[PDB]
Write a protein that binds this ligand. Structure first.
Ligand SMILES: *[C@@H]1O[C@H](CO)[C@@H](O[C@@H]2O[C@H](CO)[C@@H](O)[C@H](O)[C@H]2NC(C)=O)[C@H](O)[C@H]1NC(C)=O
Ligand SMILES: *[C@@H]1O[C@H](CO)[C@@H](O)[C@H](O)[C@H]1NC(C)=O
Ligand SMILES: *[C@@H]1O[C@H](CO)[C@@H](O)[C@H](O)[C@H]1NC(C)=O
Ligand SMILES: *[C@@H]1O[C@H](CO)[C@@H](O)[C@H](O)[C@H]1NC(C)=O
Ligand SMILES: *[C@@H]1O[C@H](CO)[C@@H](O)[C@H](O)[C@H]1NC(C)=O
Ligand SMILES: [Zn+2]
Lengths: 596, 195
């Protein structure tokens, strides 16, 4: 009896107790989120607390089977993920400070309110308060007030916490043999022991920046064009060569530019494609929306939604008294139980999202054959890219025409193609410099390169230099502007949103070619191509059993993240942007500011 | 002369755990295999060696009605020359098996919202099960090189696991009520007959 064999049996017993306990926690989180009461809250804590104390126990029994004596990479991955210590490696005092800080920052953000200056009785939460201003208002001072207040009330409290948060999270990382907390966060993408498919944690920074260089021309043109249109909407405030003020970008931070479509639409006379009205005419309910969605995956050769799915899922808001969290999520409870929780109104937004979340479900059903610890996306950015390419194909005119939601008499003209690609680029392209820079600033804070007395300084220096965005009010080192964003004060890795973006277009271009689609990549609909669903499936069923480099190659035929598909999707907008910016200025200046 | 108690085995109130697969020996009675349908949602009727069509023809020395419960994914394992946790360690069928396999979904009866851990299977065993053997020992399974001393611990795992059937599970993780009909055929009078 060797130690690889004893590890086999140890995981075999784990794989069966883990499946049984993880289910009870999943069905306790389900019964709370669907039926929020003070009884469900207690049990979701209960079953989770047993699970968090079962994993913690099992972690210690696993350390006894050293990795170097295990040669089956499938076994190695399970042991490696089970031997994660995390906060355990910190002392019972420091492991308590960190969880006090994480709970304090999360509550300061999610419960953070700022109250009117003219009216110190009226206050506003981030939602549906200030975010309602950032999205729908086109006044300058109404936007500056919310932007500056949110970062000076919520931000200033989070600053001393984030300073301690950085210190402890580093100590946790350095104790688990990681350089810094950022290096710990880049371990998601690491690969070892598989020649031809290996990948070091430092290679992610090389990859992310190398690809971002190829993005820069497309972004500098979307930036310059958006600046020109913004300059015509806030005339006295915006320079023709300087960065965009951070409070005029459509949300609180500038993460997505989707809200600037009202100000930037190239051919506003021509209409947007909105099949919401057509769905109402034909008597469509949420039942139909997911049935049509289930039909889409069946067309490419993927299975039907499980018989349990329809019985147990929450496809409509129960409304009335029984309240819920309506945020759309796809639940892989395990043991064959799959569910979607979605408060679906009959619109086009929720039609596409049902395709998106059911895309997660199809991924979960595909890799369900795997061991418990290997039932997940190949890396973090895989799972969300799978859902997004479902809304990519389903939202096209071709798919909408072939289900009876768009008349075959509507004609796809080049001006609407530009209208489409821009509203995609505001969301998709505009977030890439915001995402890359933000995780760059966190990576460098953890690695030690940015001193505490420079945190906000090097932030807005990089906001000007990379994102092309400038602060409207100068900020000293008592602000924590990154902390005012959810993902930063709630301890989530953010680079996935950059990698997920590049991954999804790699998939879509590889699937559509296997479907023999001819034309621009943004017109493609993978429907009815079983060759495409086969190619996607052979990656979906892997889960974490294979390195993310091999899984990416089984779809696109390349071992590494690439950006050419993303540019190729946006190329028709790219040359049209090079045209409409003929006599505008492309690029920005890093020492312009609206505050003098 | 008398009907074989096919009512007993197929109806029952509780069936068995597969590791302690429960055999009813059927002899000297009239067999009426056509009644074998309880209108269950995922009914299976694979038969090997003998022909399932017109199964009320051939006499046999005995008819062993083996009954137990397993989850749907494992129902395919109840067949000649299979593998997996059920056929490896719990209930093996021979290569030249000459009987019938009759399963049906029972989520109605054996699930529980709190979880039903009464039905067990045998997760580990030191050797593969010979055809129609039964293991009911609770010997603490030694996996490592130190002896276990009849108490569970490191590399010393209890060899029986519970299914924990809940009504919210899936088709393959739901309890199915298998009934094997092993048709022995010896030099004997072969009393088990009946049109
Ligand atoms: C998680 O923590 C455990 C406990 O410290 C680590 O296992 C021990 O590491 C020390 C290092 O000096 C050894 O002396 C012990 O022999 C190890 N085993 C035990 C049972 O204490 C484990 O390596 C840590 N995991 C990671 C990934 O670093
Ligand atoms: C690793 O183990 C699995 C199942 O235990 C087996 O199917 C696979 O062949 C093994 N890998 C190697 C390289 O032997
Ligand atoms: C999916 O639905 C179709 C249409 O009813 C059906 O023919 C098919 O059998 C279903 N898939 C499976 C795996 O049963
Ligand atoms: C769900 O919550 C409602 C309260 O609105 C309660 O009446 C009902 O019993 C709850 N569900 C269950 C299964 O108890
Ligand atoms: C099974 O037994 C129960 C209780 O004795 C009885 O009500 C039922 O009719 C039986 N089912 C049959 C005979 O098919
Ligand atoms: Zn999603």
């Amino acid at each position: 009896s060797t130690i690889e064999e004893q590890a086999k049996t140890f995981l075999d017993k784990f794989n069966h107790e883990a499946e049984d306990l993880f289910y009870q926690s999943s069905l306790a989180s389900w019964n709370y989120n669907t039926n929020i009461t003070e009884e469900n809250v207690q049990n979701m804590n209960n079953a989770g607390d047993k699970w968090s104390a079962f994993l913690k126990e099992q972690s210690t029994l696993a350390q006894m089977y050293p990795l170097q004596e295990i040669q089956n990479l499938t076994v190695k991955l399970q042991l490696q993920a089970l031997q994660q210590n995390g906060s355990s490696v910190l002392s019972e005092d420091k492991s308590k400070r960190l969880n006090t800080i994480l709970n304090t920052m999360s509550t300061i953000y999610s419960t953070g309110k700022v109250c009117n200056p003219d009216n110190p009785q009226e206050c506003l939460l981030l939602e549906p308060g200030l975010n309602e201003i950032m999205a729908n208002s086109l006044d300058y001072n109404e936007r500056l007030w919310a932007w500056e207040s949110w970062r000076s009330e919520v931000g200033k409290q989070l600053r001393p916490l984030y300073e301690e948060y950085v210190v402890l999270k580093n100590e946790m990382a350095r104790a688990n043999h990681y350089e810094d907390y950022g290096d710990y966060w880049r371990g998601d993408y690491e690969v070892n022991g598989v020649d031809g498919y290996d990948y070091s944690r430092g290679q992610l920074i090389e990859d992310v920046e190398h690809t971002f260089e190829e993005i820069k021309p497309l972004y500098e043109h979307l930036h310059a064009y958006v600046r020109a249109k913004l300059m015509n909407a806030y005339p006295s405030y915006i320079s023709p060569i300087g960065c965009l003020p951070a409070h005029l970008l459509g949300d609180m931070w500038g993460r997505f530019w989707t809200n600037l479509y009202s100000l930037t639409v190239p051919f506003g006379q021509k209409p947007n494609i909105d099949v919401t009205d057509a769905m109402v005419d034909q008597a469509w309910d949420a039942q139909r929306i997911f049935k049509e969605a289930e039909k889409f995956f069946v067309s490419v050769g993927l299975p039907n939604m499980t018989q349990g799915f329809w019985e147990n899922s929450m496809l409509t808001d129960p409304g009335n008294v029984q309240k819920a969290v309506c945020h759309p999520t796809a639940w892989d409870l395990g043991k064959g139980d799959f569910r979607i929780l979605m408060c679906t109104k009959v619109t086009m937004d929720d039609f596409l999202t049902a395709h998106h979340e059911m895309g997660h479900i199809q991924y979960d059903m595909a890799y369900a054959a795997q061991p418990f610890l290997l039932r997940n996306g190949a890396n973090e950015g895989f799972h969300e890219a799978v859902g997004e390419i479902m809304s990519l194909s389903a939202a096209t005119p071709k798919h909408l025409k072939s289900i009876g939601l768009l008349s075959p008499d509507f004609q796809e003209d080049n001006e609407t193609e530009i209208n489409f690609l821009l509203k995609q680029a505001l969301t998709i392209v505009g977030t890439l410099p915001f995402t890359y820079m933000l995780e760059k600033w966190r990576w460098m804070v953890f690695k030690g390169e940015i001193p505490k007395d420079q945190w906000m300084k090097k932030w807005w220096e990089m906001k000007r230099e990379i994102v092309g965005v400038v602060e409207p009010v100068p900020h000293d080192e008592t602000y924590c502007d990154p902390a005012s964003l959810f993902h930063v004060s709630n301890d989530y890795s953010f680079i996935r949103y950059y990698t997920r973006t590049l991954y999804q277009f790699q998939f879509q271009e590889a699937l559509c070619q296997a479907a023999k689609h001819e034309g621009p990549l943004h017109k493609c609909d993978i429907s009815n191509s079983t060759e495409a669903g086969q190619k996607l499936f052979n990656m979906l069923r892997l889960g974490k059993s294979e390195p993310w480099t091999l899984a990416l190659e089984n779809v696109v035929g390349a071992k590494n993240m690439n950006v050419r598909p993303l540019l190729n999707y946006f190329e028709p907008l790219f040359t049209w942007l090079k045209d409409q910016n003929k006599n505008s200025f492309v690029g920005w200046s890093t020492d312009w500011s609206p505050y003098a | 002369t008398n009907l074989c108690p096919f009512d007993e085995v197929f109806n029952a109130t509780t069936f068995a755990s597969v590791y302690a697969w429960n055999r009813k020996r059927i002899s000297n009675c009239v067999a009426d295999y056509s009644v074998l349908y309880n209108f269950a949602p995922f009914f299976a009727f694979k038969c090997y060696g003998v022909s399932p069509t017109k199964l009320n023809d051939l006499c046999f020395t005995n008819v062993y009605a083996d009954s137990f419960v397993i989850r749907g994914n494992e129902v395919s394992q109840i067949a000649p020359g299979q593998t997996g946790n059920i056929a490896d360690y719990n209930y093996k069928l021979p290569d030249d098996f000459t009987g019938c396999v009759i399963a049906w979904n029972s989520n109605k009866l054996d699930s529980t919202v709190g979880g039903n851990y009464n039905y067990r299977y045998r997760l580990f065993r030191k050797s593969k099960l010979k055809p129609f053997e039964r293991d009911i020992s609770t010997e603490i399974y030694q996996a490592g090189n130190k002896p276990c001393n009849g108490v569970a611990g490191v590399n010393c795992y209890f060899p029986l696991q519970s299914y924990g059937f809940r009504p919210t599970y899936g088709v393959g993780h739901q309890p199915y009520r298998v009934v094997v009909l092993s048709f022995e055929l010896l030099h004997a009078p072969a009393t088990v007959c009946g049109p």
